[PDB]
Amino acid sequence: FHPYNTLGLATQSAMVGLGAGVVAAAARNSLATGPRNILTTFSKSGGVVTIFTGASIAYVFTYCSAANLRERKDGWNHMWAGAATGAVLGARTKLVPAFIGWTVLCGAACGLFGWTGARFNADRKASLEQSPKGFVQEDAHQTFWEVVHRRPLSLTVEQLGEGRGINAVPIATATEAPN
């Protein structure tokens, strides 16, 4: 893999999250009920600014950091980032259990979101429609979506491991009489 730049992305992410807080502040000031003005935007707003900034900071910082600590690109990183984000959002309610719950469940949802590829879109070339499928023809390596009538035994022993009934050679032939 190629490492991430933690502070460069975190500074961009914070300015972005500050901008989103400004937009949501203005939109609330317009959509709200009672007498207001241009002052109320950052006074009477329910923490939209600190919500957005703390989330974007914590998410991107944790994803890039754990991508660099684990030294990989995968879904476990998005899980840790959603765990931080849940901590931040749940710290607003000043309770321990809801803080722990917000953390775990935001983390599981972002961790699933990284499992499925960390995108709401689709790859469109790793998909089944645009990829080889069906029966492989002649002894060729079995890809993901391909089907096979008879699998190699060496590949089985490697993917699984030996023992628990599963062996390099069958049991009868292994114990056949040399006759």
Place this chain on the structure above:
Amino acid sequence: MMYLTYYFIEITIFLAILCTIFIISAKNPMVSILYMIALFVIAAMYLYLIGLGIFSLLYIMIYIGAIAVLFLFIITLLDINSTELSVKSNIRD
């Protein structure tokens, strides 16, 4: 002499800006409709500038001649209350 008629399009742009702000700020809506008529005229001007006077005239005889006649024909007959432009009410936006 030549360049006296060089910036007419920019003038119409500035004037359309003005008429939009005036439609938005006017107290009595009837005035806002008059400014809409000013805007349709400026559009007809600009269309003449770029070589389509036929649409300038079709606009003046459709929009102004019928639609705006009707808008005045409505606001003359209905009790359309208002709330004059303010600072307590609209600054928040």
